[PDB]
Amino acid sequence: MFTINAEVRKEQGKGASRRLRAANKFPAIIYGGKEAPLAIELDHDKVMNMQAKAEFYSEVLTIVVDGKEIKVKAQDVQRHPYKPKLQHIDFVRA
């Protein structure tokens, strides 16, 4: 059910990541397996609404980048200190 439609990050770090969260997108990362890590930027409110549900952090999830449907599990999530926002997600493959 959870199908996150993601794009690939062209620039990384603090300036680039803040530039994203000012534009209602947030950074994330996919790791696991032996494939290299994949840095993705997600649309905030889309992911925000979906992680409200309980079966986002327990079921297999799928992320589409460049057309390729990559299956993952949610692994770690950086929340805003004092808002109902999201800074960063770690997705592990599975």
Partner 1 sequence: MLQPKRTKFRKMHKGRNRGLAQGTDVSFGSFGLKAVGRGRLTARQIEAARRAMTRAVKRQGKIWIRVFPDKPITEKPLAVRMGKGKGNVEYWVALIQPGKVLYEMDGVPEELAREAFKLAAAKLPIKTTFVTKTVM
Partner RNA sequence: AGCCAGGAUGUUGGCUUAGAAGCAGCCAUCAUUUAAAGAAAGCGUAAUAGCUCACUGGUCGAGUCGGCCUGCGCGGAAGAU
Partner RNA sequence: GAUGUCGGCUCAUCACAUCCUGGGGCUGAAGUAGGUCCCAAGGGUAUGGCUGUUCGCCAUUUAAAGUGGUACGCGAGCUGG
Exactly one of 36, 84, 91, 92 binds RNA (CB under 7 A); that residue is 84
Specify whether the CB–CB gap between 60 and 72 falls below 8 A.
yes
Q: Which residue has the tokens 């794009």?
A: 7
Q: What distance separates the 2 farthest-apart alpha carbons in the chain? A: 36
Residue 82 binding partner 1, by CB under 8 A: yes
Q: What span, in angstroms and rounded, lies between the C-alpha atoms of 80 and 85?
A: 5
In angstroms, what is the minimal distance from the CB of 85 to RNA? 7
In angstroms, what is the minimal distance from the CB of 49 to RNA? 10
| Residue numbers at the binding site for partner 1 (CB under 8 A) | 54, 57-58, 74-77, 79, 81-82
